[PDB]
Design a binder for this molecule. Structure first.
Ligand SMILES: CS(=O)(=O)N1CCC[C@H](NC(=O)[C@H](CCC2CCCCC2)NC(=O)c2ccc(CNC(=O)c3cnc4ccccn34)cc2)C1
Length: 332
C-alpha cells in the first residue's frame, strides 16, 4: 500500500500517493488538479469526487462513473490511469480519486479546419462511438467541450459535468418514447456542421427555438415518422414548430465537400430509427482515406444491470470500494 501525503488547495484537503507531485488546480471542471506522475514522467489529471456518498444518487452516480471509466479501453475514449482512496478499510472510506491524461485543449480551443482535418476528427468520434455504442452505452451529452484534442489532432470522447441543447437530438427535447444510441449521431452531425461552416448550426436560445431551427432545415416529420407518435397533441406540436420558412441542405453547407453534406443529411435525420449508426457512418465514402474496418474495434461485454437497481448508501459505497480495489492499472 503506497505512502500518501496531505495538502490543502482552493479550500479542499487533497490526499494522494507520493508518486503524484506538484499538484496545481486547473479550471469550473469540479475538484481537478494537474499532477506530475513520477512513475511515467507524464503530466496527469487528478479528480477528487465531491462528497461521492452524500445521498443515494451521489453514491450511485459515483459507482456508475467508476464502472464506465474502468470499462473504456479505446484510442478515441478517455481511459482510467489510476483510481485510489487514502482510506485503510471499508469503514474509513469517504473520498474517491480518479487519474486521467491531461487534455491540453477541446474541439473549441483547437478551432477554418481543412476538409482533411474535419474527415480525421469526425472519423475518430465515430470510431469512439462505435466502441461505446457496442457496450449499449449512450453519451447523451456529446459537444465540443467534451472532446479533448492534443498537439497531433488526436481526439478522446469524455464527459465533464459543466450549451447541450445545441447538439441535443429533437426526440429528447420533444420527449418522444424511442431513445436509441443514435441521439449521439445527431450530436456528431451538429458538431461536424460547426467544423465545416465555422458556425453553430442550431444556435437555440431555449429548447422551443432550438426545435424551430432544426425543423426549418430537416423539414416537418414525414408520414413514416408520424405513424410512430401516439398522442394527437405531440403530432400537432411538431407541426406547429415546422411553420418557419423551409431551409435546404445544399445552401447551408455550400463550399463543403459533397461527401460531407451527403454524410450530414444521413446524421441530421428526425427519425432516429432511420438515422445512420456510428458503424455505418465509418463506412461512408467521406472517410475513404482513414476507414480501416480491421481497426475499428467493438467494446467488451459491459455489465449495465446495476443501472436498474435501487440500493442503500452502504451498498453503492461497498460496490465502489470493490471496484477501486480490483482496478489493475493499464500497461503503458
Ligand atoms: C454526476 S456524475 O458524477 O455521475 N457525472 C456527471 C456528468 C459527468 C460524468 N461522466 C462520466 O461518468 C464520464 C464517464 C462516461 C463515459 C461515457 C462515454 C465515453 C466517455 C465518458 N467521466 C468522464 O468522462 C471523466 C472525464 C474526466 C475526468 C477527470 N479529468 C479531468 O477532468 C481532466 C483531464 N484533463 C483536464 C484538463 C482540464 C480540466 C480537467 N481535466 C473524470 C471523468 C457523470
Amino acid at each position: 500500500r503506497p505512502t500518501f501525503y496531505r495538502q490543502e488547495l482552493n479550500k479542499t484537503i487533497w490526499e494522494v500517493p507520493e508518486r503524484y507531485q506538484n499538484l496545481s488546480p486547473v479550471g469550473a471542471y469540479g475538484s481537478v488538479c494537474a499532477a506530475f506522475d513520477t512513475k511515467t514522467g507524464h503530466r496527469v489529471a487528478v479528480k477528487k469526487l465531491s462528497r461521492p456518498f452524500q445521498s443515494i444518487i451521489h453514491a450511485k452516480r459515483t459507482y456508475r462513473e467508476l464502472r464506465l471509466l474502468k470499462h473504456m479501453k479505446h484510442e478515441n475514449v478517455i481511459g482510467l490511469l489510476d483510481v485510489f482512496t487514502p482510506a485503510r478499510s471499508l469503514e474509513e472510506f469517504n473520498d474517491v480519486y480518479l487519474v486521467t491524461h491531461l487534455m491540453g485543449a477541446d474541439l473549441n480551443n483547437i478551432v477554418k479546419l481543412t476538409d482533411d482535418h474535419v474527415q480525421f476528427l469526425i472519423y475518430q468520434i465515430l470510431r469512439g462511438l462505435k466502441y461505446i455504442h457496442s457496450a449499449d452505452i449512450i453519451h447523451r451529452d456529446l459537444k465540443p467541450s467534451n472532446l479533448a484534442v492534443n498537439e497531433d489532432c488526436e481526439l478522446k470522447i469524455l464527459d465533464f459535468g459543466l450549451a447541450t441543447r445545441w447538439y441535443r437530438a429533437p426526440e429528447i427535447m420533444l420527449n418522444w418514447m424511442h431513445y436509441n444510441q443514435t441521439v449521439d449521431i445527431w450530436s456528431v452531425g451538429c458538431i461536424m456542421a460547426e467544423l465545416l461552416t465555422g458556425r453553430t448550426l442550431f444556435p437555440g436560445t431555449d429548447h422551443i427555438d432550438q426545435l424551430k431551427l432544426i425543423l426549418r432545415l430537416v423539414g416537418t416529420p414525414g408520414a413514416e415518422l408520424l405513424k410512430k407518435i401516439s398522442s394527437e397533441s405531440a403530432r400537432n406540436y411538431i407541426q406547429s414548430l415546422a411553420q418557419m420558412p423551409k431551409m435546404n441542405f445544399a445552401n447551408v453547407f455550400i463550399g463543403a465537400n459533397p461527401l460531407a453534406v451527403d454524410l450530414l443529411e444521413k446524421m441530421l435525420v428526425l427519425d432516429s430509427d432511420k438515422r445512420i449508426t456510428a458503424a455505418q457512418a465509418l463506412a461512408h465514402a467521406y472517410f475513404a482515406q482513414y476507414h480501416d474496418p480491421d481497426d475499428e474495434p467493438v467494446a467488451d461485454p459491459y455489465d449495465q444491470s446495476f443501472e436498474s437497481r435501487d440500493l442503500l448508501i452502504d451498498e453503492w459505497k461497498s460496490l465502489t470500494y470493490d471496484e477501486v480495489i480490483s482496478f489493475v492499472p493499464p500497461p503503458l
